[PDB]
Design a binder for this molecule. Structure first.
Ligand SMILES: CN(C)Cc1ccc2c(c1)c1ccccc1n2CC(F)(F)F
Ligand SMILES: [Zn+2]
Length: 196
């Protein structure tokens, strides 16, 4: 009733990477290593790098799923709020209830789990372009952390799983997410709180 969040590099040495975008007022997505937390604006591009030490088999896929971080909410499905699920902002592929979308990948598949009712989005795992050492997926988060009737100020984690063609686990990584109006200021504030 609760997906695992344990970091697991697996046989291929799977792990995530993030750009260094800074904390300027104007930044739209920024990652804090000290907090293991991504701060982003609503529906803006969030680049997430995928790194491996060795090449996984054809048919490997990469899935993203959100869960609530606090244990007393972790059995509740993370979904879009009653306003955003009805705002008709579909991209033609993502169900309107799903918080996490993949941008610019026509092979993305969206799952409503028939047993847990949790949402996820999965894409085929492709090698880097020539000249690149990693692959990048572009995610969008489609509600604010503050949305009433949805996340309602509760922190979430995103769990990224590397899976075989049957859906079996090959690797796992995760990060906290805050979707907010001013990610640069919020990252600075939370990093200073941590240091204090
Ligand atoms: C092995 N390093 C140095 C390069 C590298 C980095 C990421 C790579 C690959 C290769 C690669 C090859 C085939 C299929 C998917 C691949 N990916 C994405 C994945 F990390 F697995 F999510
Ligand atoms: Zn919302």
């Amino acid at each position: 009733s609760v997906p695992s969040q344990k970091t697991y590099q697996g046989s291929y040495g799977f792990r995530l990477g993030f750009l260094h975008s800074g904390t300027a007022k104007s930044v739209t997505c920024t990652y804090s290593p000290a907090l293991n937390k991504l701060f982003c604006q609503l529906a803006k591009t969030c680049p997430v790098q995928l790194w491996v030490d060795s090449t996984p088999p054809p048919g490997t896929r990469v899935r993203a799923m959100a869960i609530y971080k606090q244990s007393q909410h972790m059995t509740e499905v993370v979904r879009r709020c009653p306003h955003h699920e009805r705002c008709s902002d579909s991209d033609g592929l993502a169900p309107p209830q799903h918080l996490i979308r993949v941008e610019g990948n026509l092979r993305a598949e969206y799952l409503d789990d028939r047993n847990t009712f949790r949402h996820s989005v999965v894409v085929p795992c492709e090698p880097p372009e020539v000249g690149s050492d990693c692959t990048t997926i572009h995610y969008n988060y489609m509600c604010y952390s503050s949305c009433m009737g949805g996340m309602n100020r509760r922190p979430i984690l995103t769990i990224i799983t590397l899976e075989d063609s049957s859906g079996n686990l090959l690797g796992r990584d995760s990060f906290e997410v805050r979707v907010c109006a001013c990610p640069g200021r919020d990252r600075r504030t939370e990093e200073e709180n941590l240091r204090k």
